[PDB]
Structures are given as C-alpha cells and as structure tokens.
C-alpha cells in the first residue's frame, strides 16, 4: 500500500511533472509505452495484462502545454481523462484562477482525484507542483488545496513551489499572486518546498559547466530531488523515511513549514574522474551557500531541522561521523532549543542517469531538506516589493473586476507581516 498521487498545476507544474515521470519510468524499467521489462506500486497502478499507469493528474486552464503531452514521447502513458484543459488561462491573475475560471473546472478534477484515491489502498499523500507567480498556479492551487482539506482533512499534502527571486523576475504582478496564494496555502499545507530559478541557474553554470541553461535543463535537477525524497517509499533501504516523517520532523510550529531542499553532487561527465566522492564531502557540500536552491542568506539565520536523504553505497558510521564533524563546525548555527538537528535516511538505490543528460553517474548522493530562519528575508523582500505597488493601486483594476475585494489584499499583507514576525521570534 502507501501509494502517493501527483498533481500538476499550471505550466510549471506540468513541465516539472514531465521530467519527473520520465525519470521514474527509467528508474523502474518502464518503457515510454507502459510495459515493464511491487516496489513501484506506490506511484504506478496496473490494469490490463502488463501495462503500468501513473497516478497523476494534470491541470491547466489552457490546452497549450498539455496538448504537447498528449502528442509527444509519453502520449501512451496517460489515459486522456487524467489530462484536463481547454479554456482561457488565468492571465497571471490570482482572482481568475480562484474565482472566475477555477469555478468551471474544479468538479471534474476533484472527481478524478477521488477516483484515483479509490483505486488505491490507503495512500499516504499528495505531491502538488506549481509556481506562485502564475494566475493558475496561484489561484487555482489554493482552491484545490481547500477541496483536498474538505475531503481528506487527515492526509498529508506536500508541495513544490517555484518561488520568484526579484532579480530574475519574468512577470509584472508576481508579488500580488505570491502573497495572496501564500496566505491560502498556509492553513492547508503540511510543508512547502521552495525552489528558486536563479539558484538553479547558478548551480548549472558553476558545477555543471553549462553557460546556457534551458528550462528543460533546470527541471531535471528538480526531478532528481523529488526522486531522492520519495525513494525511501519506493525501495528497500537500511534506514527508511516516509511522508508522515517529514511533517513530524521539520515543523516545530504549525505556521513555520517552509524548508529548502539542496542536492549534491552535481557533476558534469568530465569532472567525475578527478573527484574523490566522499560521504563526508557531499555532506560538506550540502551546507555551503553556493549549493542552496533558494537564495536566502543562510549564514545569517539558524537551522531548525535538517533531513539528510542518502542514496547509493553508504556506511552509516561514516555518515554519523560526517554529521558530528558538521555539528562541530562553529559558523553553522542551530537553534539553542534543539540540540540534535539531523534526521537521517538511507537508500540502497543509486540515483539514475537520463539519456542525453547533463549529470554524471554517481555512487553516493544526498538530498538535504533543511528549515532555516533566513528564508524569512525572502518574504520581507517580497513584501517590500508588494508595498510600493500597492501604494499606487497599480494593476488593481484587473483583480477587483474578477470578484476579488480590496481589503483582502490588506489582510494578506497583515498575515505575511505576522508570519515574518513569528520567524524573528522563534530564532531567539
């Protein structure tokens, strides 16, 4: 049992899903048709004689992206009714995503979700992929979250949010969308793993030696993180970790559930033969600011909770020693009210290699989930961004005309402020 279902919302959600599912297929020896040539049960169902099918749902208020899915390399992996499309997009308008356009499609997707749940025996949770800056990825996601809360108040819900750094912003109204949606997210999410594009880009240039990263490139890395996360559910280990565990171990306080995921080692085909790939070495890499997937100012804050998910050939003793060493380093700071900061998980599967990929085959790998106070700074900058725009009512007409009232914005701002204050408090 223990099955888990993926929900992909908006363009970002879809394209990430594309990579992820591809990766999964390669991992379990599933060809792009669906035949194999159990462990995988947690992500793939079976029907017919030999064909395997993703427990996944793709949602977009526009057909463009999902049309490519329908007519691509993986057209035969998905039954057509797990792809929902067809309409006008929430044109980077949270309100449209949430009120006008979300209203028309919600029931269909919810039915699908229910069906998927019913197919399975006692699934643990949901993995939700989206951006904060998109009208669909913002407005619709919140609505969906609400629905999920209503249906299964008990069950775990994890998300992968594509978070915008102000210097690499591609959309004008990113601040409004992010703030409104984040408030809604707050009450119904168990934890949200933030990813920053800029950081990814940086990683690509420095550690993969690629000057010109495409979106396609970026997504691969993200997929690997996902794989690392859920490998313990899919495979036999020495020491295991589940979705329930993460919630337990990362959230000191209800409101403070926004941790950063980092990954290592990230190596080109060339650099590996001059690389002593150590357990300690990768751990070390994990706590160096250049390897963060969110640009956050990590050294200024303190760490509250840290999960280290190793995969490949590992000696637990060595891991322990590495951890000890890390603890002993002075500059890295944990909160004084938590002496013991690391949840450790081990997995016997070596991470996989994508045909035509950027990443070298490695024998030891690690994904760290880490919660730091420093991430509050990101919110502060976002709030600052919001505050000036709000001041002149810039772009407000678009939102008001979509059945969203003005005091709502104010409320959201207040909430964000309170959240920020909270981080400041808990760091003492």
């Amino acid at each position: 049992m223990r099955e888990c279902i993926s929900i992909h919302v908006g363009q970002a959600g879809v394209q990430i899903g594309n990579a992820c599912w591809e990766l999964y297929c390669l991992e379990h020896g599933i060809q792009p048709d669906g035949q194999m040539p159990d462990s995988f049960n947690t992500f793939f169902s079976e029907t017919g004689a030999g064909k395997h099918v993703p427990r996944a749902v793709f949602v977009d208020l526009e057909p463009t992206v999902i049309d490519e899915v329908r007519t691509g390399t993986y057209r035969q992996l998905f039954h057509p009714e797990q792809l929902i499309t067809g309409k006008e997009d929430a044109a980077n308008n949270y309100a449209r995503g949430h009120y006008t356009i979300g209203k028309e499609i919600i029931d269909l997707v919810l039915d699908r979700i229910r069906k998927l749940a019913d197919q399975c025996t006692g699934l643990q949770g949901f993995l939700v992929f989206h951006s904060f800056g998109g009208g669909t990825g913002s407005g619709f996601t919140s609505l969906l979250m609400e629905r999920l809360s209503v249906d299964y108040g008990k069950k775990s819900k994890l998300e992968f949010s594509i978070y915008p750094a102000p210097q690499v912003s591609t959309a004008v109204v990113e601040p409004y969308n992010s703030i409104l949606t984040t408030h809604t997210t707050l009450e119904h999410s168990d934890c949200a793993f933030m990813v920053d594009n800029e950081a990814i880009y940086d990683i690509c240039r420095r550690n993969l030696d690629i000057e010109r990263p495409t979106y396609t490139n970026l997504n691969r890395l993200i997929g690997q993180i996902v794989s690392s996360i859920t490998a313990s559910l899919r495979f036999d280990g020495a020491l295991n970790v589940d979705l329930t565990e993460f919630q337990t171990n990362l959230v000191p306080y209800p409101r403070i559930h926004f941790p950063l995921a980092t990954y290592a080692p990230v190596i080109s085909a060339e650099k590996a033969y001059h690389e002593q790939l150590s357990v300690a070495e990768i751990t070390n890499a994990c706590f160096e600011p250049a390897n963060q997937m969110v640009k956050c100012d990590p050294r200024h804050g303190k760490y509250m909770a840290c999960c280290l998910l190793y995969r490949g050939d590992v000696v637990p003793k060595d891991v322990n020693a590495a951890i000890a060493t890390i603890k002993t380093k002075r500059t890295i700071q944990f909160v004084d009210w938590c002496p013991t900061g690391f949840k450790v998980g081990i997995n016997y599967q070596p991470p996989t290699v994508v045909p035509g990929g950027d990443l070298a085959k490695v024998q030891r790998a690690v994904c760290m989930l880490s919660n730091t106070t420093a991430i509050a700074e990101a919110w502060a900058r976002l709030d600052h961004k919001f505050d000036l725009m709000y001041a002149k009512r810039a772009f407000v007409h678009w939102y008001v005309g979509e059945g969203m009232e003005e005091g709502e914005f104010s409320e959201a701002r207040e909430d964000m402020a309170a959240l920020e204050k909270d981080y400041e408090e808990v760091g003492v």
Binding site: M1, R2, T121, G122, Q124, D236, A238, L239, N240, D242, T244, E245, Q247, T248, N249, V251, P252, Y253, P254, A305, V315, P316, K317, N320, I323, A324, K327, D336, W337, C338, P339, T340, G341, F342, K343, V344
Partner: protein, 426 residues
Amino acid sequence: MREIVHIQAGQCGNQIGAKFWEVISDEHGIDPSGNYVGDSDLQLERISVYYNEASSHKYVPRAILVDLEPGTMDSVRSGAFGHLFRPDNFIFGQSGAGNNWAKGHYTEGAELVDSVLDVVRKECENCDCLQGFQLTHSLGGGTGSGMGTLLISKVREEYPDRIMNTFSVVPSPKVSDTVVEPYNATLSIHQLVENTDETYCIDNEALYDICFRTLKLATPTYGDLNHLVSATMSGVTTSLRFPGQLNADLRKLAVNMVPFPRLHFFMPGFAPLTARGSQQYRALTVPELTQQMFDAKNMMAACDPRHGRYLTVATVFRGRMSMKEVDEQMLAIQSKNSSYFVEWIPNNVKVAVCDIPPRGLKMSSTFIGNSTAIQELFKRISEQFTAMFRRKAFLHWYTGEGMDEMEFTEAESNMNDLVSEYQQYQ
C-alpha cells in the same frame, strides 16, 4: 518445561529478532526450510523452549512479528530463513506511526492490539508451562516505543506473575536519527518503569565504536552490529536451553540483580570481542575474558562505569572452565579496586557456568551490570526534554493524537525520581 514467547515490534526489533532467530536456529542445528540437521541429543532436548514441532518433525519459533509499517515485514519474509516463520504470526497494520509516539500508543496501536493479544493467548494455551516474554524494540520511534509499551501493559494485565524481558535500543546525544527522540524516549521509559522485570539498555554509538576500534572494521553494517546483540540475547538464556554445572534462568538473574523494584535497567557487555586478523595472538582463558568484560570499552550502553558504581553484576560463561578459577578472578576484580562496588551488598557478583559454547569460539562470557552510571544516560535525555518543552516545540503533533501536557510532566517527573534514586544508592 520453561517455555518462552518472543516478540519483535518496529523496524529495529524485527531485524535484530531475525538475526537472533538465525543464530539460535544455527546453534540448535535447525535449517531455514529444513527441519533438522542437529549433531547432538542436547540440542534436541530443549528445542521446545523456543520452538513448536509440527508433523514430520518440522520446527517453528514461538515468535510474533509486529509493525505498523508493512514494508519491514516484507523484508523479513523476503530474506533467506523467512520460510521458517508461521504465517499467522505476521501481524502488521496499514500505515506507520512516523516517529509520533502518540500514534503508536493510541490511534493505530489500539487498532492493532487485539489480533496480537489473541495470538499471544493462543501461544500460551498451546503450551504446558509458560516462563516469560522477550520483547525487542526501540525507544526512539513511534511503533517500537508507543505500541510496544501498550502491548506490554496488556500482557501484564493478563499474567501478572510471568517474566517480562525487553531489549531496548537507546538514544545517543551526538547521533540522532530523529529530532523528536527526547519526547519518544521519555514517554516509553515511563511506561517501562511500571511493567518490566528487566530491561537491557543498548546503544548504537557504542556498537559502532566497538566495530571500529576493537574489531578493527572500516565498514560496519547494521547486520554486523545486530550480531553482537543477538549473541548477547543467546547468552542470557543459555541456562534454560542447556545442562550446565551451575544454572541461572531469567528469573534467577532478575532476583539476583534487582535490589529495588524501580532499578531494573541492565547494561550488557560481552566477551571476547576479537578481530579477524588479531585472534591468533591470544591464549583463550578465563582471566582474559574477565579482564575484557569490565572494560568501559565493552559496555554496550554509552555510559562510563568509572563515574558510577556497580550494585550487582551477573556473569554467564559458556564452554568448559574451572569454576574455582572464575571465582578467584571475580574475587580479584572485587578486592583490588572495590572503589566502584557498593559496600552494603557484600558480594556483588553472580556466576553461571554452562557447558555448551557458541558456534565459532571455545569460551565466552556475557556480563549484565546494574550500574548507577546508567543515570547519566537518563540525565542527558531529561535535559534535552527540558530544552524542547520550554519552547513547546513539536508538541502540536502529540496533542493532535490525544496527548496532553500533563502526561509529559508526569513522565519527566518519574524519570527525575528514578535518576535521584540511582544517585542516592551511589
């Protein structure tokens, strides 16, 4: 006569238990699917302590395998030697506790308990004479800690006079594989306090150290570590399973080693811990074994016996020896450095000598110490609890499962009391 029930709860228990079964089967000449390959009448004589015997002379452990997470069960069966277990003794829930003690103890544990209870009753009524129970589990996780203790409680209600043994792995300060270990440990240890006759405290850190520095191994796996534990387990019960010159069952040790009801936490040690390249340069003998057993390095619990005192020690020796020699060694140990032996208990050493040594080595010793140094272990945990509880960190999850602040306070208080008691007698 003198028949035992084994129970394994949570991941650690299940794996350790498996290892134990492999060992003891090997000792008594039993093959994995194979019925019998034993070399001696002695082995045959006391098979009925741990095993049952179906038609055509098959054999099956009186073992129960429990977990809220289905996966580990799968692993256990999938291993070689997995066909020996009766399929009706696999009793698993649907979703794991996820290191939430409360879940282990209320929501899923309660749902699980009835089947377990029924199987235990079945096991009891089947056999003529019931001696005791052996539970293997952790204090750091949700299932082993929470559900296990519930199970124990239930057992106690049923049979008040029977023996309760637990082999409990313990948290260590530098290495924490879960952030909520202080809470988990605290809650479960409280529960243990009231319902167990003897509890064997085991640390991973210590085991690692042993593997690294004594056995001179660069790459310790969990299996290797578990091996030591298995050996220890085997050693404890050798008196029930073989004729010796001096015999000491579970009850005997318990009576000998517990001066006050509360103080029933035993620190095991084992000898000889030899390395592969290093073994041929030792004369195998009583005195050497004795010397090894009282080194701080060979305490499986990560506490220094130098900073406390022994109330009592039990020594179980396997292979042929001169009892006189053993006694003289004991005397030497006592008189020479009586600095760490309590004055009011005159002779602090208990001896059992069993004729049949383990497979591999010719003479071996298991040491079971009731040391006041164990308070140190509890102290750190208490401190950590205090640190967490002041900020109310991670309380919310526990609250969500029925728990309330008062329980935490009470358990901590109890722990403190226990600590104080140990100190007083030191």
